Description:
It is classed as isomerase. By secondary structure, this protein is of the alpha+beta class. The chain has 2 domains: 1-32, Ubiquitin Ligase Nedd4, Chain: W (Single Sheet), CATH 2.20.70; 38-147, Chitinase A, domain 3, CATH 3.10.50.40. Helix content is 23%, strand content 25%. It contains 3 helices and 7 strands. The strands form 2 sheets. A 4-stranded antiparallel sheet has the order 5-4-7-6, sandwiched between helices. Strands 1-2-3 form a 3-stranded antiparallel sheet, with no helix packed on it. The structure holds ~{N}-(2-fluorophenyl)ethanamide. ~{N}-(2-fluorophenyl)ethanamide is lined by residues 98-99, 101-102, 105-107. Residues 98-99, 101-102, 105-107 line the site of ~{N}-(2-fluorophenyl)ethanamide.
Amino acid sequence: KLPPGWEKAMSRSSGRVYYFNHITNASQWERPSGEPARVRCSHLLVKHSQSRRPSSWRQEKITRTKEEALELINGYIQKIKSGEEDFESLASQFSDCSSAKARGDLGAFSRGQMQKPFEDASFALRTGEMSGPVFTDSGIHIILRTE
Ligand SMILES: CC(=O)Nc1ccccc1F
């Protein structure tokens, strides 16, 4: 059982079973629900000093470490999941991608166009679903599949 990409896990802190997707890095308490030619995604990118281009509209020289970037991503995911903040709001303010000006929207795309870990996570997400941290040569992404 379980849709592909998904595995059963156990919370270290509560002992309750949860589910983890090793393609999207998503995790959820509910047993998961379950390929299109194209998907539409938004994303929030946090770059780091080893990003292919360690620069963005937010910062001419991005100096943070991969670990600092993952902490920031993790914090954004927490606030999005709690509802304290909207994905679109955090992407507009803090995404190191030029798509920040479009609330993170990348428009629609096919397989073959995006960096592979991003593509795989995008196509494995269900409509409306959000990824966990997804790593590419650009940095660390939160991906929201919108279509
Ligand atoms: C046009 C759009 O939808 N998104 C966008 C805007 C600026 C840079 C990159 C982008 F993906």
